Write an enzyme that holds these catalytic residues in place. Structure first.
Site, PDB file in Angstrom:
ATOM      1  N   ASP A  91      41.584  15.150   6.090  1.00  0.00           N
ATOM      2  CA  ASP A  91      40.459  14.781   4.952  1.00  0.00           C
ATOM      3  C   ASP A  91      40.193  16.089   4.012  1.00  0.00           C
ATOM      4  OD1 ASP A  91      37.017  13.995   5.454  1.00  0.00           O
ATOM      5  OD2 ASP A  91      38.654  13.082   4.012  1.00  0.00           O
ATOM      6  N   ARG A 125      33.760  16.902  -0.658  1.00  0.00           N
ATOM      7  CA  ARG A 125      32.792  17.112   0.428  1.00  0.00           C
ATOM      8  C   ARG A 125      33.044  18.073   1.726  1.00  0.00           C
ATOM      9  NH1 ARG A 125      35.534  12.551   3.868  1.00  0.00           N
ATOM     10  NH2 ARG A 125      36.653  11.504   1.998  1.00  0.00           N
ATOM     11  N   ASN A 126      34.377  18.272   1.795  1.00  0.00           N
ATOM     12  CA  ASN A 126      34.876  19.311   2.728  1.00  0.00           C
ATOM     13  C   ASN A 126      35.065  20.532   2.323  1.00  0.00           C
ATOM     14  OD1 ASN A 126      34.521  17.604   5.055  1.00  0.00           O
ATOM     15  ND2 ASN A 126      36.472  16.556   4.433  1.00  0.00           N
ATOM     16  N   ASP A 157      36.609  21.742   6.827  1.00  0.00           N
ATOM     17  CA  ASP A 157      36.523  20.732   7.646  1.00  0.00           C
ATOM     18  C   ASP A 157      37.734  20.458   8.555  1.00  0.00           C
ATOM     19  OD1 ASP A 157      35.201  17.856   8.268  1.00  0.00           O
ATOM     20  OD2 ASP A 157      37.212  17.328   7.497  1.00  0.00           O
TER      21      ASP A 157
HETATM   22  N1  LIG Z   1      29.779  27.445   7.086  1.00  0.00           N
HETATM   23  C1  LIG Z   1      28.868  26.616   6.300  1.00  0.00           C
HETATM   24  N2  LIG Z   1      28.195  27.598   5.247  1.00  0.00           N
HETATM   25  C2  LIG Z   1      27.218  26.837   4.557  1.00  0.00           C
HETATM   26  N3  LIG Z   1      26.844  25.575   4.733  1.00  0.00           N
HETATM   27  C3  LIG Z   1      27.359  24.710   5.532  1.00  0.00           C
HETATM   28  C4  LIG Z   1      28.502  25.345   6.586  1.00  0.00           C
HETATM   29  N4  LIG Z   1      28.956  24.289   7.346  1.00  0.00           N
HETATM   30  C5  LIG Z   1      27.925  23.332   6.839  1.00  0.00           C
HETATM   31  N5  LIG Z   1      27.171  23.524   5.915  1.00  0.00           N
HETATM   32  C6  LIG Z   1      26.197  22.643   5.349  1.00  0.00           C
HETATM   33  O1  LIG Z   1      26.008  21.394   6.351  1.00  0.00           O
HETATM   34  C7  LIG Z   1      26.524  20.202   6.111  1.00  0.00           C
HETATM   35  C8  LIG Z   1      27.108  19.754   7.251  1.00  0.00           C
HETATM   36  O2  LIG Z   1      28.385  20.266   7.195  1.00  0.00           O
HETATM   37  P1  LIG Z   1      29.669  19.269   8.382  1.00  0.00           P
HETATM   38  O3  LIG Z   1      30.737  20.664   8.454  1.00  0.00           O
HETATM   39  O4  LIG Z   1      28.799  19.516   9.654  1.00  0.00           O
HETATM   40  O5  LIG Z   1      29.862  18.266   7.912  1.00  0.00           O
HETATM   41  P2  LIG Z   1      30.271  17.072   9.025  1.00  0.00           P
HETATM   42  O6  LIG Z   1      31.003  15.930   8.296  1.00  0.00           O
HETATM   43  O7  LIG Z   1      29.275  17.051   9.905  1.00  0.00           O
HETATM   44  O8  LIG Z   1      31.555  18.094   9.878  1.00  0.00           O
HETATM   45  P3  LIG Z   1      33.047  18.225   9.249  1.00  0.00           P
HETATM   46  O9  LIG Z   1      32.930  18.727   7.925  1.00  0.00           O
HETATM   47  O10 LIG Z   1      33.556  19.153  10.240  1.00  0.00           O
HETATM   48  O11 LIG Z   1      33.474  16.755   9.648  1.00  0.00           O
HETATM   49  C9  LIG Z   1      27.281  20.697   5.002  1.00  0.00           C
HETATM   50  O12 LIG Z   1      27.500  19.436   4.010  1.00  0.00           O
HETATM   51  C10 LIG Z   1      26.824  21.524   4.309  1.00  0.00           C
HETATM   52  O13 LIG Z   1      25.851  21.108   3.446  1.00  0.00           O
END
Ligand SMILES: Nc1ncnc2c1ncn2[C@@H]1O[C@H](COP(=O)(O)OP(=O)(O)OP(=O)(O)O)[C@@H](O)[C@H]1O
Length: 260
Positions: A133, A137-138, A151
């Site tokens: 992915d 967004r990631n 991500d």
């Molecule tokens: N390491 C970080 N530093 C700063 N902000 C973060 C971080 N991780 C997440 N965020 C914020 O929290 C939100 C959720 O991120 P998250 O990675 O949980 O998305 P998800 O789709 O739930 O998980 P993934 O990206 O692993 O699938 C992000 O969009 C960002 O706004």
């Protein structure tokens, strides 16, 4: 080695909402040193082991990687409330950062973000790790000159996916390149989503007819040609990240010289 004692962490502001729970900014503190700003991914349904295993899977995966443009795992608290502690990228999701700074960010910085992500992805390619992915967004933003892939643990994203991923569910190094092409397009489009206002099924049929995302306004033609290669219908015709990295480096230098 990665387990953290949660009295060494203080929750701060909710900086986003994740798939499993809220993400908070905060601080990890051990008696001597900083003052380490951290993100804390929480998992509201963690008491269910099914969701906990899927939640902590991200941390397990992140753990294998060590690269300047990939989000670093700092630790986990595995007693529920289960938390994942990671590197804070203070500026947050790349998309929003791009939408907000639409008219304040130079082209040089955009290509630099593309380039920085090509270095992370070359590195993952070197480890034979398939991300699945790659999307704006990631990507997280560390500073105005530093972007980081974030991500792991994943997810439908039809408009970012390589044909073979949509159709045959095949996820490969070559499909990651397709998605990186789309991510590059997103960056150059200032965090605008691909194929916005088109049905997922219509994108599928368009792609198969030779149709592609248009050249972003103010995109260098050299950079759009590179995106076009990432979108070869035939995965074997797609470049690898060694070549993408080298070409982005070269596109970057020429944009820096284009205003001196
Ligand atoms: N390491 C970080 N530093 C700063 N902000 C973060 C971080 N991780 C997440 N965020 C914020 O929290 C939100 C959720 O991120 P998250 O990675 O949980 O998305 P998800 O789709 O739930 O998980 P993934 O990206 O692993 O699938 C992000 O969009 C960002 O706004």
């Amino acid at each position: 080695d990665y387990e953290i004692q949660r009295e060494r962490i203080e929750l701060g502001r909710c900086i986003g909402e994740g798939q499993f729970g809220d993400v908070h900014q905060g601080i990890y503190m051990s008696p001597e040193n900083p003052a380490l700003a951290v993100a804390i991914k929480t998992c509201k349904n963690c008491t269910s082991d099914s969701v906990r295993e899927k939640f902590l899977q991200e941390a397990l995966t992140m753990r294998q990687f060590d690269h300047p443009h990939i989000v670093k795992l700092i630790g986990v608290i595995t007693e529920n409330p289960v938390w994942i502690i990671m590197e804070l990228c203070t500026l947050g999701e790349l998309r929003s950062f791009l939408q907000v700074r639409k008219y304040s960010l130079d082209l040089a910085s955009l290509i630099l973000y593309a380039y920085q992500l090509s270095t992370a992805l070359a590195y993952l390619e070197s480890k034979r790790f398939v991300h699945r992915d790659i999307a704006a967004r990631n990507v997280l933003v560390s500073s105005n000159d530093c972007v980081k892939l974030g991500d792991f643990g994943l997810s439908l994203p039809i408009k970012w996916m390589a044909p073979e991923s949509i159709n045959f569910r095949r996820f490969t190094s070559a499909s990651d390149v397709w998605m990186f092409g789309v991510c590059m397009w997103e960056i150059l489009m200032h965090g605008v989503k691909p194929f916005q206002g088109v049905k997922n099924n219509d994108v599928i049929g368009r792609i198969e007819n030779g149709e592609r995302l248009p050249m972003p306004p103010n995109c260098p033609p050299t950079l759009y040609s590179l995106m076009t290669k990432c979108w070869a219908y035939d995965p074997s015709r797609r470049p690898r990240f060694t070549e993408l990295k080298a070409q982005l480096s070269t596109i970057l230098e020429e944009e820096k010289a284009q205003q001196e």
